[PDB]
Amino acid sequence: TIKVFTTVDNINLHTQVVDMSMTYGQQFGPTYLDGADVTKIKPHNSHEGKTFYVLPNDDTLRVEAFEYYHTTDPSFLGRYMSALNHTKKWKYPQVNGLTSIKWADNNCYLATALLTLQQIELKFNPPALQDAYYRARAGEAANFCALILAYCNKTVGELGDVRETMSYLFQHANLDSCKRVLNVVCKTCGQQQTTLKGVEAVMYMGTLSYEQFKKGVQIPCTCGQATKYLVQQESPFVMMSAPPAQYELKHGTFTCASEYTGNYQCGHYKHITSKETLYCIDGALLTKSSEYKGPITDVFYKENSYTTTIK
Ligand SMILES: Cc1ccc(N2C[C@H]3CC[C@@H](C2)N3C)cc1C(=O)N[C@H](C)c1cc(-c2cnn(C)c2)nc2ccccc12
Ligand SMILES: [Cl-]
Ligand SMILES: [Cl-]
Ligand SMILES: [Cl-]
Ligand SMILES: [Cl-]
Ligand SMILES: [Zn+2]
Ligand SMILES: [Zn+2]
Ligand SMILES: [Zn+2]
Ligand SMILES: [Zn+2]
Ligand SMILES: [Zn+2]
Ligand SMILES: [Zn+2]
Ligand SMILES: [Zn+2]
Ligand SMILES: [Zn+2]
């Protein structure tokens, strides 16, 4: 026999004694070690004392699991552990003061999201995401990336869209204080004003330019081509997206941006960030230039409180 700790959150640990002739699956249920599925594996001697993740099998663990992850999905733990099994093997080099990811397993979109998250103000609601976020900012991002995959219901190797990943992540973050007031001007119908809250207040699809959004954009009306423009914005940042197209990025006019090259779904992302000059982060690779023209699909801008001056 050996003694071990079981857990669902790696915080509340539960002391357990195992029989060395019985696989973990028969004694605990699905059991994992550092992401590795050890369900159908018998206890070893090097396994003495180590802490194992277990799928919740009593009410105490179910409550602990929800409090840490904010999900009751019985598949979440296994998807998380399956991702972690790869992400713990990726490299996370510091590039220009930011934790990036060396290229592997189609992770370019994850590197771009990871880099963006280090440059905008965000509070995640699940303790598991917040804790991993902090550790990620300090260079240890394997767990954060695994969690991103599990929360986005994506698997290692799958082809990911950065805008969609950020949107999923935003939905697990505290964006309640975020507010966007819009005004639509139709010649026949008139003037209608809507207010958005949460994730919808910080994201727009249609143009990369925050200025253009403030000046107004052409959207078809219910009557059938009105104009929508930003009336008031209340958020620490905004994300502007558009299908990839050549675009000029000017130093000091944006926080950071997603560059996307190639075919729909199987292309490659790079990350552009505005520091004292423009830096391009391609996984572990870093280039700099005073101007930038290229195929851009997301642009992030800082914000606090904006009210329009249109009467
Ligand atoms: C890399 C990648 C992975 C997965 C997906 N999926 C998209 C759809 C289908 C499955 C799942 C994930 N989503 C539900 C997309 C891309 C991808 O390539 N995203 C780039 C940024 C992109 C976006 C758009 C676009 C977005 N919205 N509209 C109206 C348009 N248009 C593009 C046109 C050409 C090239 C790139 C484009
Ligand atoms: Cl929740
Ligand atoms: Cl791997
Ligand atoms: Cl890649
Ligand atoms: Cl949540
Ligand atoms: Zn407990
Ligand atoms: Zn929650
Ligand atoms: Zn892998
Ligand atoms: Zn969710
Ligand atoms: Zn109308
Ligand atoms: Zn109308
Ligand atoms: Zn400049
Ligand atoms: Zn890639």
Side-chain angles (χ1 to χ4, degrees), residues 66-67 69-71 124-127 151 171-173:
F66 177 81
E67 293 177 350
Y69 302 103
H70 287 217
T71 190
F124 287 116
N125 295 319
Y151 276 106
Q171 276 163 267
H172 297 78

Side-chain angles (χ1 to χ4, degrees), residues 93 95-101 108-120 144 166 256 270-273 280-283:
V95 173
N96 190 227
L98 294 158
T99 307
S100 190
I101 324 179
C108 65
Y109 80 106
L110 288 167
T112 296
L114 174 57
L115 290 164
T116 306
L117 287 165
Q118 290 162 86
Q119 299 173 70
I120 58 175
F144 190 52
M166 302 292 312
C256 64
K270 288 185 211 181
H271 179 81
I272 318 302
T273 174
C280 175
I281 302 183
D282 187 6

Side-chain angles (χ1 to χ4, degrees), residues 86 89-90 105:
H86 303 262
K89 290 189 270 129
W90 297 350
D105 302 345

Side-chain angles (χ1 to χ4, degrees), residues 103-109 267-268:
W103 148 66
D105 302 345
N106 289 322
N107 67 0
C108 65
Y109 80 106
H268 188 69

Side-chain angles (χ1 to χ4, degrees), residues 95 270 278-282 285-289:
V95 173
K270 288 185 211 181
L278 296 187
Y279 284 94
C280 175
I281 302 183
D282 187 6
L285 306 179
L286 181 59
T287 57
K288 32 183 296 192
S289 74

Side-chain angles (χ1 to χ4, degrees), residues 251-252 276 290:
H251 166 260
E276 81 285 3
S290 59

